[PDB]
């Protein structure tokens, strides 16, 4: 009670590098979908990736 721990919106801390990592995964998913459309990888390879 004396310290009175609480919980705010900005207390929910995402790590600083999420945006870097989400963009990296988005760039790799964009490249594979183009080459899957090209017929350079098959469906299971795209589904696994």
């Amino acid at each position: 009670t004396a310290t009175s721990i609480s919980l705010g919106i900005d207390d929910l801390l995402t790590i600083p590098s999420k945006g870097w990592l989400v963009q990296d995964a988005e760039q790799q998913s964009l490249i594979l979908e183009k080459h899957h459309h090209y017929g350079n990888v098959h469906a299971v390879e795209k589904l696994r990736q």
Binding site: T1, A2, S4, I5, G8, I9, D11, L12
Partner: protein, 1040 residues
């Protein structure tokens, strides 16, 4: 529902209207022209003369005096006396058809009833394959008729096809095919594999196949498993036709539709019977699919289901009603013929068949349920439920485990969140906001069509059935994305063939654009729902249905915008039926006059629901106000200004406070008590009935022997409690004498309150005595107390465990103490972040004098859309009102507050705000129970079960295990013998404890063991208990 949210009762409204138009005519047909055995007297109905007349009792009167709201059926009949060759046609009386209210509920015996929808497998052909013991794949095709008749086509180990009908009755295809007359020659030509069928032709089957009748007899032998050779007869075919053809060969309009599709057949629609080609065509796919040709049928797919509304349930009971009438007439025409009389057509038909089968349909059918009237939210959501249970549907034990799961065909039709809790989980569904019932029993949701340049497309909103749902690429994203290319090549998430993709906009066919498309009413009332875990969304929906209407109601500062829809479609507020001007307003009525039509609208004042919740209406307009047709006139209970208002906006802090909010406890302030913030009215009903006994009818009188005048002080001369008297626990309500033992009606425990309504009413009947009924209604004003349950709209529930004075509560930097204190540890484990968003925005709205109605999933516009909305509105309230603590740049949403006991600030900033908190029905004064001793069961002689019966608590086997784990062998014997059923030892314990003189061991058997011995004696088994003395080895027989 193309451009607006449809009425929540529109499915009930349209279904009932369909029954009136086509259900009556389609069922008044098929009524046989009844003829006697001699053919002398012919009775028939003229269905084109059918009529319905408006009910004589008003809808308010039907519920007031426990009647049924129904309309008369007055078809005309023609009776033919060929003896006289004269015709007599009269308007005969068939029965009463119950009428649905504009809200979608019926009234039977003064009880509101709702007919819920049912889900069951759609008729057609279904292909399944199941592994055997050795893993060999076994394919199967199943015919489903219009009445659930399943015709299973199976391939065995020897590739022999058997038309299985039951678990044992097995019939080959050739015998079944030749049973109808398919000659053995043509069966081979119409299939791709004539060899397979010919390989199974034993010389015994060929002779029976060669002739049509021998196949029928052999088919009967295998279907019936009856020893002997049956004789071919017309009755045998009719007996088989009712059992087999009537139940397993009529597909119906829907059944033909699917068979034409799944078996790829160009058969006319009007053919509602299973054509013999379908069976032979099915065998082609069944054997053909074994070789990789095609795909199996998905049984959980919504395209293989149908929905039965009130239209189907009321029409079906009419099928039973008229079939019940013909058996009445047949007995009646035969009875009057034997007397050689000429009976009028009215006397041949009584109203009992129709009236009783509808009276007993609402009473007994599981799909007919009592309307829940706790609050306006419960009135509308009850009618929109979808159940797999009920007649013709799977039971909880019967239910498959692959069912109860979410299927991709449910999206936009069945809410993925709303379901029942317990054994019936996943079996009771709920319709979505925009869902619609199609013309084939299928659920439809609207999607926006994107088409090419050269297309008219007058209306681009088309409702999509689940069968055609898979074959469209439906996107839910937006088009706010551009790069150095063009917009059509930007990628968005989409659905196609029951999977989720990421394709370009130019490949998208349909868009899902409605905000409340995929949710039910319960989940659509949760603001910031996208920040709550879906597990708590199910819990939050249930809790909103348990909210108690408060004596004073107020609108929520933060909402979703669906509160206005709920208020309009619930019927609780008064809605104008005619444009005009307001001329007079008061508590009891509102007078509206328009276009030479002056109406008077009464207002409900302190009425009772089925859940003991008060109903009350207050005017919302003033004299001299112009009104449009369909605009609000007055506000009902839990409704303010035309919106659903189930709770209050209170000042709230999220911090631990000395353990009084441990786990899920809630600490509140006295201001919520003496301010009557959470005060609710509760009305109970007490009924007494007068019966005619052998000694004479029961009498009601004020003069009751062996009673004090203090107990009877509130009675009038007639013997009934006076209107407006404060009764007490044990007080008298209705004084009744049974010849004379006192059989009066007394007030139960905890029922103290004020009597507000008394109804001394006689039910007029054909006897010399009419049953008198008395109904006493007692109001109870319940302020919030310790042990009451409160909850927010985010699955955040809690019990009040402590009430503090305002000077002890923590207070803000403006000096105001908070009203509730919540434990902050309940957020991370429950994962409902949407309550933190709502409290901060509720505080901002109260300072800015603003209300917010926010549609869900606002992050479709931008990232952190809810954060920008809440933070910017918090800063606006801070700046305008000069309250820098409202928005803190260091920690937005949180502020330093002070301890009300010391005046010192708490070390960490606390998230404070003004959320919307509800008061739930689950509360003390309805759960506290105690028992010393009293009444016991007649057979087991154990204490009764139930708080209402003053029963005791059960010590089950798991509780006995715990006592055996402790080794407390004497505590266990107390709860087994002389506190439960040892009749002799229960009376001695009552005596010793009042004198304090030590309790001895029972040493005898309780009445539960002696009860078991007699039952074992009834099976010719003797069970004796012997004691062998360790001193002299004498065997002693215990008395049992």
């Amino acid at each position: 529902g193309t451009s607006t949210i449809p009425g929540f009762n529109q499915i009930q409204f349209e279904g009932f209207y369909r029954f009136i138009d086509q259900g009556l005519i389609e069922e008044l047909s098929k009524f046989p022209k009844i003829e006697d055995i001699d053919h002398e007297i012919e009775f028939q109905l003229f269905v084109e003369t059918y009529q319905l007349v408006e009910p004589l009792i008003k809808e308010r009167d039907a519920v007031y005096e426990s009647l049924t709201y129904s309309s008369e059926l007055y078809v005309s009949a023609g009776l033919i006396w060929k003896t006289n060759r004269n015709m007599q046609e009269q308007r005969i009386f068939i029965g009463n058809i119950p009428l649905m209210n504009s809200l979608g509920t019926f009234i039977v015996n003064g009880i509101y009833r709702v007919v819920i929808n049912q889900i069951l497998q759609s008729p057609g052909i279904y292909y399944q394959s199941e592994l055997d013991h050795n893993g060999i794949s076994v394919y199967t095709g199943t015919i489903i008729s219009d009445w659930g008749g399943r015709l299973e086509l199976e391939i065995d180990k020897k590739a022999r096809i058997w038309a299985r009908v039951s678990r044992k009755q097995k019939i080959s295809i050739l015998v079944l095919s030749s049973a109808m007359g398919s000659n053995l020659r043509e069966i081979l030509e119409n299939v791709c594999y004539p060899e397979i069928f010919l390989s199974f032709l034993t010389d015994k089957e060929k002779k029976k196949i060669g002739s049509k009748e021998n196949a029928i007899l052999e088919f009967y032998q295998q279907f019936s498993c009856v020893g002997g050779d049956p004789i071919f007869s017309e009755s045998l075919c009719k007996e088989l036709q009712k059992k087999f053809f009537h139940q397993r060969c009529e597909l119906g309009r829907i059944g033909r539709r699917n068979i034409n599709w799944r078996l790829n057949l160009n058969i006319p629609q009007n053919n509602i019977f299973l054509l013999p080609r379908d069976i032979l065509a099915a065998a082609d796919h069944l054997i053909g699919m074994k070789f990789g040709m095609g795909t199996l049928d998905d049984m959980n797919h919504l395209k293989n289901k149908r929905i039965r509304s009130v239209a189907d349930l009321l029409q079906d009971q009419l099928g039973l009603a008229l079939a019940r009438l013909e058996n009445v007439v047949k007995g009646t025409i035969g009875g009057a013929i034997r007397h050689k009389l000429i009976p009028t057509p009215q006397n041949l038909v009584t109203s009992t068949p129709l009236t009783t089968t509808y009276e007993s349909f609402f009473g007994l059918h599981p799909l007919s349920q009592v309307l829940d009237r706790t609050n306006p939210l419960t009135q509308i959501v009850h009618g929109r439920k979808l159940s797999y249970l009920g007649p013709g549907g799977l039971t909880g034990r019967t239910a498959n485990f692959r069912i109860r799961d979410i299927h991709p065909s449910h999206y936009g039709r069945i809410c993925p969140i709303d379901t029942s809790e317990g054994i019936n989980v996943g079996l009771i569904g709920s319709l979505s906001i925009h869902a619609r019932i199609g013309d084939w029993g299928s659920l439809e949701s609207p999607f926006y069509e994107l088409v090419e340049k050269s297309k008219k497309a007058q209306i681009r909103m088309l409702f999509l059935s689940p069968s055609q749902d898979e074959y469209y690429m439906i996107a839910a994203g937006n088009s706010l994305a551009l790069n150095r290319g063009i917009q059509e090549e930007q990628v968005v998430p989409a659905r196609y063939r029951q999977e989720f993709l990421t394709i370009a906009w130019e490949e998208v066919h349909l868009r899902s654009i409605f905000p409340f498309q995929y949710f039910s009413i319960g989940a659509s009332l949760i603001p910031f729902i996208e920040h709550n875990d879906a597990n708590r969304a199910l819990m939050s929906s249930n809790m909103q249905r348990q909210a108690v209407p408060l004596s004073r109601s107020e609108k929520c500062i933060v909402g979703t915008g669906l509160e206005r829809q709920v208020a309009l479609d619930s019927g609780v507020p008064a809605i104008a039926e005619h444009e005009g001007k307001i001329l007079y307003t008061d508590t009891e009525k509102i007078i509206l006059s328009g276009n030479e039509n002056t109406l008077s609208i009464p207002l409900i004042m302190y009425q009772r629901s089925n859940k003991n919740t008060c109903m009350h209406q207050k005017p919302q307009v003033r004299r001299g106000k112009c009104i449009k047709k369909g605009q609000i006139l007055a506000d009902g209970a839990a409704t303010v200004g035309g919106e659903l208002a189930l709770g209050k906006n209170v000042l709230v802090a999220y911090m631990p406070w000395e353990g009084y909010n441990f786990e899920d406890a809630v600490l509140i302030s006295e201001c919520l008590v003496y301010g009557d913030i959470y005060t609710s009215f509760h009305i109970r009903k007490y009924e007494i009935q007068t019966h005619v006994t052998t000694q004479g009818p029961e009498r009601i009188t004020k003069e009751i022997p062996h009673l004090e005048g203090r107990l009877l002080r509130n009675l009038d001369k007639n013997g009934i409690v006076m209107l407006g008297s404060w009764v007490e626990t044990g007080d008298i309500l209705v004084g009744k004498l049974t010849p004379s033992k006192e059989t009066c009606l007394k007030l139960p425990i905890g029922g103290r309150g004020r009597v507000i309504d008394v109804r001394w009413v006689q039910k007029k009947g054909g006897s010399s005595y009419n049953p008198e009924i008395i109904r006493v209604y007692i109001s109870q004003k319940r302020e919030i107390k310790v042990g009451d349950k409160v909850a927010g709209r985010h699955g955040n529930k809690g019990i009040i465990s402590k009430i503090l004075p305002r000077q002890d509560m923590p207070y803000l930097q403006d000096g105001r103490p908070v009203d509730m204190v919540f434990n902050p540890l309940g957020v991370p484990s429950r994962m409902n972040v949407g309550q933190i968003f709502e409290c901060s925005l509720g505080l901002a709205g109260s300072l800015l004098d603003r209300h917010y109605r926010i549609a869900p999933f606002d992050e479709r516009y931008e990232q952190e859309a809810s954060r920008k909305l809440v933070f910017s509105e918090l800063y606006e309230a801070s700046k305008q009102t000069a309250n820098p603590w409202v928005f803190e740049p260091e920690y937005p949403g949180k502020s330093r507050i002070f301890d009300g006991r010391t005046g010192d600030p708490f070390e960490q900033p606390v998230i404070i705000g003004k959320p919307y908190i509800l008061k739930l029905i689950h509360q003390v004064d309805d759960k506290i129970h105690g028992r010393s001793s009293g009444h016991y069961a007649l057979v087991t002689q154990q204490p009764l079960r139930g708080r209402s019966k003053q029963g005791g608590q059960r010590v089950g086997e798991m509780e006995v295990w715990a006592l055996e784990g402790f080794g407390v062998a004497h505590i266990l014997q107390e709860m087994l013998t002389y506190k439960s059923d040892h009749i002799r030892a229960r009376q001695e314990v009552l005596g010793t404890t009042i004198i304090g003189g030590t309790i001895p061991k029972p040493e005898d058997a309780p009445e539960s063991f002696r009860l078991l011995v007699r039952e074992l004696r009834s099976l010719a088994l003797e069970l004796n208990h012997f004691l062998v003395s360790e001193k002299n080895f004498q065997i002693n027989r215990k008395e049992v």
